[PDB]
Design a protein around this motif. Structure first.
Motif, PDB file in Angstrom:
ATOM      1  N   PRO A   1       0.834  -1.199   0.000  1.00 49.92           N
ATOM      2  CA  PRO A   1       0.000   0.000   0.000  1.00 49.92           C
ATOM      3  C   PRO A   1       0.867   1.246   0.000  1.00 49.92           C
ATOM      4  O   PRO A   1       2.041   1.220   0.371  1.00 49.92           O
ATOM      5  CB  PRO A   1      -0.798  -0.130   1.296  1.00 49.92           C
ATOM      6  N   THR A   2       0.269   2.357  -0.415  1.00 51.84           N
ATOM      7  CA  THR A   2       1.007   3.587  -0.642  1.00 51.84           C
ATOM      8  C   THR A   2       0.276   4.750   0.012  1.00 51.84           C
ATOM      9  O   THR A   2      -0.945   4.731   0.172  1.00 51.84           O
ATOM     10  CB  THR A   2       1.180   3.844  -2.152  1.00 51.84           C
ATOM     11  N   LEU A   3       1.047   5.765   0.394  1.00 52.88           N
ATOM     12  CA  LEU A   3       0.538   6.953   1.060  1.00 52.88           C
ATOM     13  C   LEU A   3       1.092   8.178   0.354  1.00 52.88           C
ATOM     14  O   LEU A   3       2.304   8.288   0.147  1.00 52.88           O
ATOM     15  CB  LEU A   3       0.924   6.966   2.540  1.00 52.88           C
ATOM     16  N   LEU A   4       0.200   9.090  -0.007  1.00 54.37           N
ATOM     17  CA  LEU A   4       0.448  10.144  -0.979  1.00 54.37           C
ATOM     18  C   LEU A   4       0.053  11.474  -0.361  1.00 54.37           C
ATOM     19  O   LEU A   4      -0.849  11.540   0.475  1.00 54.37           O
ATOM     20  CB  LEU A   4      -0.322   9.924  -2.283  1.00 54.37           C
ATOM     21  N   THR A   5       0.745  12.532  -0.759  1.00 50.11           N
ATOM     22  CA  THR A   5       0.758  13.759   0.015  1.00 50.11           C
ATOM     23  C   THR A   5       0.387  14.919  -0.896  1.00 50.11           C
ATOM     24  O   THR A   5       0.806  14.972  -2.055  1.00 50.11           O
ATOM     25  CB  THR A   5       2.139  13.957   0.651  1.00 50.11           C
ATOM     26  N   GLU A   6      -0.398  15.848  -0.354  1.00 50.90           N
ATOM     27  CA  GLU A   6      -1.108  16.844  -1.140  1.00 50.90           C
ATOM     28  C   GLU A   6      -1.191  18.144  -0.353  1.00 50.90           C
ATOM     29  O   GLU A   6      -1.141  18.143   0.879  1.00 50.90           O
ATOM     30  CB  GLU A   6      -2.510  16.338  -1.505  1.00 50.90           C
ATOM     31  N   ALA A   7      -1.311  19.274  -1.092  1.00 48.93           N
ATOM     32  CA  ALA A   7      -1.522  20.570  -0.468  1.00 48.93           C
ATOM     33  C   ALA A   7      -3.017  20.860  -0.357  1.00 48.93           C
ATOM     34  O   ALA A   7      -3.813  20.357  -1.155  1.00 48.93           O
ATOM     35  CB  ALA A   7      -0.840  21.664  -1.284  1.00 48.93           C
ATOM     36  N   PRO A   8      -3.433  21.675   0.619  1.00 47.97           N
ATOM     37  CA  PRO A   8      -4.793  21.540   1.161  1.00 47.97           C
ATOM     38  C   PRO A   8      -5.926  22.074   0.295  1.00 47.97           C
ATOM     39  O   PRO A   8      -7.050  21.576   0.393  1.00 47.97           O
ATOM     40  CB  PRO A   8      -4.718  22.334   2.473  1.00 47.97           C
ATOM     41  N   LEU A   9      -5.667  23.071  -0.551  1.00 46.30           N
ATOM     42  CA  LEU A   9      -6.722  23.701  -1.337  1.00 46.30           C
ATOM     43  C   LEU A   9      -6.632  23.399  -2.828  1.00 46.30           C
ATOM     44  O   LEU A   9      -7.402  23.969  -3.607  1.00 46.30           O
ATOM     45  CB  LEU A   9      -6.711  25.211  -1.106  1.00 46.30           C
ATOM     46  N   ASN A  10      -5.717  22.528  -3.243  1.00 45.42           N
ATOM     47  CA  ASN A  10      -5.466  22.303  -4.658  1.00 45.42           C
ATOM     48  C   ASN A  10      -6.724  21.783  -5.356  1.00 45.42           C
ATOM     49  O   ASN A  10      -7.584  21.167  -4.722  1.00 45.42           O
ATOM     50  CB  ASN A  10      -4.313  21.321  -4.841  1.00 45.42           C
TER      51      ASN A  10
END
Ligand code: ADP
Ligand code: ADP
Ligand code: MG
Ligand code: MG
Lengths: 7, 735, 372, 139
Positions: C99-108
């Motif tokens: 499994p994988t965990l992916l990271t993002e900025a909050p309002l994109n």
């Protein structure tokens, strides 16, 4: 983006 | 279902659990009239029943017809006090009760008497278990474990001492000398004192006796498991860490130690912590004089001995060393702090290098390396982790230098192994150390129950009886609660990771997962802080306070590397030379060590010896009914007896059955037909082929109806002989 | 067992490793290389694209595009290359195993979630996945449960006040000021000393200048006057071809743009003001905790002195009654990944995953509903 | 009982009168019943006597006319053999065991009565042929 900015 | 007039019953009393009563009236269906001083008794939806003297003496708790806690306790009481006799069997199990006086019963002529004999043929004695091990290894080449269990008083050491003396003394025969010389060392490093009593082996202790292809001892190999590391750092009240530290402290006045600047045990933070600096049992210097003798005799040279005492003086010094804090994220050691400098002088390392690496921890990914300041709390927990890792490696080293002296010249054909492990336990404050002890015990009782059920299904097979309703309680659903994902250990170790974690929030997670979802887990109504586990023996309640500080171990690899650099003496760099293990936490290390234990056990067929404190306050060879019931429930004895009573507990050999009774050819059908006259339902007992198998009451039912018919014949003879003779007597007077 | 993959998409870098590692094993720029010229020799290796450190090595010959600008994935075909290169080449691990965990900025833009998920389930066939807001992870990394996190990367700057496990979404503020736009401004101002950088590949020379030389002024105008008065602040750096360049008071002027984005022409105030103004959006009751727990995160914060400048300026703007404290872990550039490691290793987290079955039924809309 | 039986019983009863008042003691009632052919147990004797207490059993006196209904009430081999086979199948019984059971269980008898009846009935091993002893004691 799609508006207010180039991305 | 029956009570006659004057059918005795056992009735409960709080002071001492069971008291007999004379049942002065035939019962018919809610108040009942009984004498001890005579009182009526009142019922709800029934007293158990008291075996006649013919049964009461017996060696064998299975042979009793009324099977219950009163009968068992009464036998063990009369067998301990009134009869000065030491041992009993229950099912497959021997049960041993501390006589606390030194007795002729152990002796070489009797060792020889027990040799070449099978457990039924002769009286319960510890030698019988070692015989069944030996003869099994002769029958079928599997390796025998013999398991000795119970509260810290019960004498698991001295029982294993005899069980080894047996094998050596029969074998042909130098093992005893070394093995018995070794215990002062292994106890001195591995025994501890607790609120309850003052020798307690916290590690779990295993001897293998190795055998030649023709059967003799080749020699011996020791192992250990489940070492309770946390006692080094942390101690409850009235309790002490491993005796050797106090032995050092009492020695410190002597000129050799003088360099080490060891003070009083109250002075050092690790020995201080339990508030119990001095003890009845020994002036500790006197014990070490024998620890040192045992070392010299067991081939650990003075050159190593002084190194070990140097390491332990180090571990005692480390506790003294205490951080100012600059900032939430920061710790500092004051510009001189004496114990750290002395510790470095002991072990030849740069004050600056420890001082830096103690405070800071390193991080690197290949592009760049980074050094973090860390809080005073992580500096403490890392120092304590280092103390634990050092101790547990010194222990795993000493066990090898013992074994180097202990091993055989030659390959063993097979071995027989003797194991000393603390029993299931309850204390009136309960702590992660006890949750470990109880968990290991429950996981062994899983094997106990499996061996019981298997040997019973064999005994039902070899002489045939229908095989369903052969039954055992299953502890596996509690083990799953402890071991599985989102189990009680799993949330504990998780919250060790989670950014700010506390006993309160851990318990809150335990409640949210388990609280009314998992039948075996419960909350004490009056407290958030604790929780209740429904163990196989009993419900037990653990205080979450100070789990995590005990639970949490991790060692900064820099700090150990600084030690592994040292020139000053062989031993310190030697220990480590042997990461992921540094990541790992006392609960997870205990879990794994316990798996290594049960793998080494399951490769081996068991034999079981179960050992109870009969007594409190060390009064010799007297007995207290309060303790023994707790002890025996804690040993799964009462489980086994309850399980047996439901089914077909008793066995009778037809040969003994007819030798016992002629009260009514071929013996098998003769006895069948007699029993059919006596008994009214086939469901209520069974015919084996050498044996007969009776449901629990039926033996006492038969014994009573036989004794009543015999009494009727007594009264008819007494009457007729009086009719003829006393008439003859007065007529002779008439002359 | 099975141990989760943890993978962080910046704009400038990709960082990836297995859960429970102390630091990511793979770090490389998220940059895609294409040739600009005729291949001269037959038999040469004829490559159609380069990815990451390959494109670093060959950058002279190449066009260096970024797939991500302002935390938004701009062209999904090269992004696919970035991920494929990560999993097979850097980690040597098949995604189907982990499994994988992916990271993002909050309002994109919301669509970025669906597409990023769809590529994991359809293209890589990952067993399960989750997506995390960077500022949340920074708290796991620093080791606390109440924080205002300021993070600034190559792509995005944002603030997320988190109180005792609860994020407070209305407070969230985002500025598109970033390590990239400090770089473009660095080119513009370098032109004034006579040094002129045109091409994509030259930008990375500039970026190395910025990373080595720059620093944050504690009083901007007094150091401007000092450097106009005295040379000593001037410092000098070596082009890849060996020409020296020597750089002066201007080297701080790029860090200053974060405080005074009017230089580039932004509407929105400097990060210090937005930080205070975001605290103001919160309840009074929490504020005492946030004024202590200022957490800086992401590589743009690495400029020496940014902590002391931030503390000084926010103190003057704060109500005097409250002390201000600032926390700057020396690895903080990693801290978003360190946090994603801690969070992915937790046992309680396990039920959070979007599982392949669940996605297969739900459709990629599921990300909005379950994940946040 | 007919007149002849009543006469034999009265004569026997008068033989048991050791005081001359034409009466016997309660404690003699059982003895008279046994001498007259009845084989009541001590329990049965006390029951027809009304379970008397020691004092009246030893000193209260009843004449024949009151005794007679009790004798009547009392009046109105294989078990004995099995009972002896209890104490055995070669036809013998240990002398020690028979002595112990007869003097210590049930309605215990004296050692002298048992010695008297056993005289000449035990062999060299100290074994009693119980079938012969039983036939002898039932005659
Ligand atoms: N069978 C026995 N014979 C003689 N003494 C015994 C026996 N069992 C226990 N003891 C006494 O109790 C202690 C038993 O050994 P110890 O190591 O203290 O118990 P444990 O092994 O349970 O920790 C000793 O003091 C010993 O004198
Ligand atoms: N030591 C440093 N000093 C100043 N700036 C740095 C330093 N290291 C990296 N940076 C800048 O950080 C930015 C990348 O930050 P990063 O956290 O990697 O972004 P993301 O991870 O979101 O892609 C780049 O502009 C880079 O120039
Ligand atoms: Mg012991
Ligand atoms: Mg970032």
């Amino acid at each position: 983006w799609x508006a207010x900015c180039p991305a | 279902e029956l009570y006659t007039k004057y059918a005795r019953v056992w009735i409960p009393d709080p002071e001492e659990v069971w008291k007999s009563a004379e049942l002065l009236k035939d019962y018919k269906p809610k108040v009942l009239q009984l004498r001890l001083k005579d009182l009526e008794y009142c019922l709800d939806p029934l007293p158990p029943l008291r075996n006649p003297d013919i049964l009461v003496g017996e060696n064998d708790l299975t042979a009793l017809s009324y099977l219950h806690e009163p009968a068992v306790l009464h036998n063990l009481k009369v067998r301990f006090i009134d009869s000065k006799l030491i041992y009993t069997y229950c099912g497959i199990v021997l049960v041993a009760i501390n006589p606390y006086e030194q007795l002729p019963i152990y002796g070489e002529d009797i060792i020889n008497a027990y040799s070449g004999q099978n457990m039924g043929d002769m009286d319960p004695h510890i030698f019988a278990v070692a015989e069944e091990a030996y003869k099994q290894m002769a029958r079928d080449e599997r390796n025998q474990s013999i398991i000795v269990s119970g509260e810290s008083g019960a004498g698991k050491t001295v029982s294993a001492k005899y069980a080894m003396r047996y094998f050596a003394t029969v074998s042909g025969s130098n093992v005893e000398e070394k093995v018995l010389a070794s215990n002062p060392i292994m106890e001195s490093i591995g025994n501890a004192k607790t609120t309850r009593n003052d020798n307690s082996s916290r590690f779990g202790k295993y001897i293998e006796i190795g055998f030649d292809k023709r059967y003799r001892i080749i020699g011996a190999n020791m192992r250990t498991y489940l070492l309770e590391k946390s006692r080094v750092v942390f101690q409850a009240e009235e309790e002490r860490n491993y005796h050797i530290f106090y032995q050092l402290c009492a020695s410190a006045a002597l000129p050799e130690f003088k360099t080490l600047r060891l003070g009083n045990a109250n002075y050092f933070h690790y020995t201080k912590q339990g508030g119990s600096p001095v003890i009845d049992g020994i002036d500790d210097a006197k014990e070490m004089v024998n620890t040192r003798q045992a070392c010299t005799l067991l081939g650990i040279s003075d050159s190593y001995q002084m190194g070990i005492f140097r390491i332990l003086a180090g571990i005692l010094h480390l506790g003294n060393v205490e951080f100012a804090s600059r900032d939430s994220d920061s710790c500092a050691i004051p510009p001189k702090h004496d114990p750290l400098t002395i510790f470095c002088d002991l072990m030849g390392v740069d004050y600056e290098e420890m001082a830096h690496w103690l405070c800071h921890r390193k991080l690197a990914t290949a592009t760049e390396t980074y050094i973090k300041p860390i809080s005073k709390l992580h500096a403490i927990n890392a120092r304590d982790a280092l103390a634990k890792h050092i101790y547990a490696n010194l222990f795993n080293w000493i066990v090898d230098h013992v074994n180097k002296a202990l091993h055989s010249t030659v390959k063993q054909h097979s071995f027989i192994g003797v194991l000393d492990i603390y029993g299931f336990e309850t204390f009136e404050i309960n702590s992660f150390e006890q949750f470990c002890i109880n968990y290991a015990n429950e996981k062994l009782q899983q094997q106990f129950n499996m061996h019981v059920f298997k040997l019973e299904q064999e005994e039902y097979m070899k002489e045939q009886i229908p095989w369903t309703l052969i039954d055992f309680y299953d502890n596996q659903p509690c083990i799953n609660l402890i071991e599985a994902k989102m189990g009680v250990l799993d949330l504990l170790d998780e919250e060790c990771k989670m950014p700010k974690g506390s006993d309160d929030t851990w318990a809150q997670k335990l409640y949210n997962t388990h609280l009314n979802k998992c039948a075996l887990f419960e909350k004490p109504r009056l407290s958030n802080k604790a929780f209740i586990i429904k163990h196989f023996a009993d419900k037990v309640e653990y205080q979450c306070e100070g789990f995590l500080e005990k639970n949490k171990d991790t060692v900064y690899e820099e700090q150990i590397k600084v030690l592994k650099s040292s020139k000053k003496f062989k031993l310190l760099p030697e220990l480590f030379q042997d990461s992921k293990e540094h990541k790992k936490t006392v609960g997870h290390q205990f879990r794994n060590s316990l798996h290594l234990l049960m793998e080494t056990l399951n490769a081996t067929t068991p034999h079981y010896v179960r050992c109870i404190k009969p007594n409190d306050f060390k009064f010799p060879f007297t007995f207290d009914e309060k303790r023994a019931v707790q002890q025996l429930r804690a040993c799964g004895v009462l489980e086994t007896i309850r399980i047996s009573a439901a089914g077909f507990p008793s066995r009778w050999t037809y040969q003994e059955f007819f030798s016992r009774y002629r009260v009514l050819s071929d013996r098998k059908q003769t006895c069948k037909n007699v029993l059919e006259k006596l008994i009214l339902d086939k469901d209520k007992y069974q015919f084996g082929k050498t044996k007969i198998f009776f449901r629990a009451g039926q033996v006492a039912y038969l014994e009573k109806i036989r004794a009543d018919k015999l009494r009727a014949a007594c009264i008819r003879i007494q009457k007729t002989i009086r009719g003829w003779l006393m008439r003859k007597k007065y007529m002779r007077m008439r002359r | 067992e099975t141990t989760a993959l943890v993978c962080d998409n910046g704009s400038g870098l990709v960082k990836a490793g297995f859960a429970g590692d102390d630091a990511p094993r793979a770090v490389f720029p998220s940059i895609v290389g294409r040739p600009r010229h005729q291949g001269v020799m037959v038999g040469m290796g004829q490559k159609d694209s380069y990815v990451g450190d390959e494109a670093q090595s060959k950058r002279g010959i190449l066009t260096l595009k970024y797939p991500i600008e302002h935390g938004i994935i701009t062209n999904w075909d090269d992004m696919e290359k970035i991920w494929h290169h990560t999993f097979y080449n850097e980690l040597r691990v098949a995604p189907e195993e982990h499994p994988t965990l992916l990271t993002e900025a909050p309002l994109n833009p919301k669509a970025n979630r669906e597409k990023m998920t769809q590529i994991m389930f359809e293209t890589f066939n990952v067993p399960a996945m989750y997506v995390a807001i960077q500022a949340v992870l920074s708290l796991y990394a620093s080791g606390r449960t109440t924080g205002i996190v300021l993070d600034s990367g190559d792509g995005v700057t944002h603030n997320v006040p988190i109180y005792e496990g609860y994020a407070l979404p209305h407070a969230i503020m985002r500025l598109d000021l970033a390590g990239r736009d400090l770089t473009d401004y660095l080119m513009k101002i370098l032109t004034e000393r006579g040094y002129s950088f045109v091409t994509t590949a030259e930008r990375e020379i500039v970026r190395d200048i910025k990373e080595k030389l720059c620093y944050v002024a504690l009083d901007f105008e007094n150091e401007m006057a000092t450097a106009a008065s005295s040379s000593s602040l001037e410092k000098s750096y070596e082009l890849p071809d060996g020409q020296v360049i020597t750089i002066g008071n201007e080297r701080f002027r790029c860090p200053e743009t974060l405080f005074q984005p009017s230089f580039i022409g932004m509407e929105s105030a400097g990060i210090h003001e937005t930080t205070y103004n975001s605290i103001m959006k919160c309840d009074i009751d929490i504020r005492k905790d946030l004024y202590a727990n200022n957490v800086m995160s992401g590589g743009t914060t690495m400029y020496p002195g940014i902590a002391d400048r931030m503390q000084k300026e926010i103190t003057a703007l704060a109500p005097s009654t409250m002390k201000i404290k600032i926390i700057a872990p020396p690895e903080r550039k990693y801290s978003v990944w360190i946090g994603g490691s801690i969070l992915a290793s937790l046992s309680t987290f396990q039920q959070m995953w979007i599982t392949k079955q669940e996605y297969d039924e739900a459709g990629p809309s599921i990300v909005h509903r379950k994940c946040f | 009982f007919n007149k002849d039986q009543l006469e034999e019983f009265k004569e026997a009863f008068e033989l048991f009168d050791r005081v001359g008042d034409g009466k016997i003691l309660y404690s003699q009632c059982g003895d008279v019943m046994r001498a007259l052919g009845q084989n009541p147990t001590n329990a049965e004797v006390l029951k027809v006597l009304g379970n008397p207490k020691s004092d009246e059993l030893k000193s209260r006196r009843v004449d024949f006319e009151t005794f007679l209904p009790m004798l009547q009430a009392v009046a109105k081999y294989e078990d004995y053999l099995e009972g002896f086979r209890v104490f055995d199948g070669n036809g013998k019984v240990m002398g020690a065991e028979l002595r112990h059971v007869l003097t210590t269980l049930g309605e215990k008898m004296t050692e002298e009565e048992v010695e008297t009846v056993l005289a000449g009935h035990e062999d060299s091993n100290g074994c009693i042929n119980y079938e012969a002893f039983l036939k002898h004691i039932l005659s």
